[PDB]
Amino acid sequence: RGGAPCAFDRFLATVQGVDAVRAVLESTPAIPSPVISILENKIVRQPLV
Amino acid sequence: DSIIRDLERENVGPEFGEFLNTLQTDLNSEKPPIEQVKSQLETHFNLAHETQEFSRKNDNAPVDKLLTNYYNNYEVNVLEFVLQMGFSRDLSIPLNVWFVLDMISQLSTSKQDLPLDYYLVLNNSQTGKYSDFVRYLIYEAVGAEIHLANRGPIRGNVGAGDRKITFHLLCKKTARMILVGDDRETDFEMSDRSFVTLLLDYYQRVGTTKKIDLLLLTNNFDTNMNNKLQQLKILESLNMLKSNCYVLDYQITVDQVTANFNSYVEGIPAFRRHEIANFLKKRKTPKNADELIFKYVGRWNICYQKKFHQGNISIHQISGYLD
């Protein structure tokens, strides 16, 4: 659980982190609460539910 | 229509939105689309009195046909790279638009013209909001039903001589889209200072080395950054103006900026040289030091000649380069 993140994690957290902020701004009650996910090397916003 | 939605938002009145539905060019008719959208503007927005006053207040200057007037068929139709450094604070948004459209109108009389490239810079909060209304009006004017995009130049055939055109609208929206790789979320601040330099960054990245042959300069809003003298000076600096570039400054309001511009362009080499230096000692501070105005200072050795003048509207041409 300890130590510096690996190359991929550094990328994954930084990129999903930026999208999380975007997902907040890009929100309305009509658009469901997401989980910032990764699929085919593409960041995707899946529903938390 | 997508534009009409963003308009109602940016505090723009119903007038503009409404116009984009009463706007229709007849593809069949002998009268060119640019002239059709040109008349439709004066008809809907009533630019009849404002143009009369824009003429009257400038000593009956033919604001109407400024190029047609000074140039001849060849000279006008030979100009191929135009940069219009903003809209004039003294005129309404439609009159500015109408003027833009009218410039292209004059530049495309003949059918024996090498393609035109017109760039229009909307550099402040007041004008930027109308860029998409301006691009829609141009998409019609040039008749891009030849074969619109969120970002990108409008191509078509324009004027009486069906001249090939490529209209480039440079603005902050386009700048914000570019920086974020066209990401949906563009709601972040950009200052008009930041803006001038990203324009310069794009020109330096785009590999543009085709020279400006007609410079339209006016009384832009946000004088602090969007200054005419400071605008001219930077283009002088960067080797961006053609050896025989024409420079048209147009407005109604006369101010210190106008006197200075006039005294620089119209001034003897010693004068020009001292101005560049006086500004440098007077305005440069260690905080200020990095500004584009401290790097791209002008070239006193560029010589101009008065080619036309009617109180507050003038054409000067680059006469020679001292070295």
From Swiss-Prot, chain A:
It comes from the Eukaryota. Coiled coil: none annotated. It is found in: Cytoplasm. Catalyzes the phosphorylation of D-fructose 6-phosphate to fructose 1,6-bisphosphate by ATP, the first committing step of glycolysis. Belongs to the phosphofructokinase type A (PFKA) family. ATP-dependent PFK group I subfamily. Eukaryotic two domain clade 'E' sub-subfamily. Heterododecamer of 4 alpha, 4 beta and 4 gamma chains. This is ATP-dependent 6-phosphofructokinase subunit alpha. It comes from Komagataella pastoris. The chain holds residues 496 to 544 of 989 of the full protein.
UniProtKB/Swiss-Prot annotation, chain B:
Pfam families: PpPFK_gamma-like_C. Pathway: Carbohydrate degradation; glycolysis; D-glyceraldehyde 3-phosphate and glycerone phosphate from D-glucose: step 3/4. GO terms for cellular component: cytoplasm. Its main location: cytoplasm. It comes from the Eukaryota. It is found in: Cytoplasm. CDD domains: PpPFK_gamma. GO terms for biological process: glycolytic process. InterPro entries: PpPFK_gamma, PpPFK_gamma_sf. Keywords: Cytoplasm, Glycolysis. This subunit is only found in some Pichia species. Structural subunit of pyrophosphate--fructose 6-phosphate 1-phosphotransferase. Not required for catalytic activity. Fine-tunes allosteric regulation of the ATP-PFK by ATP, fructose 2,6-bisphosphate and AMP. Heterododecamer of 4 alpha, 4 beta and 4 gamma chains. The gamma chain bridges the N-terminal halves of the alpha and beta subunits. This is ATP-dependent 6-phosphofructokinase subunit gamma.
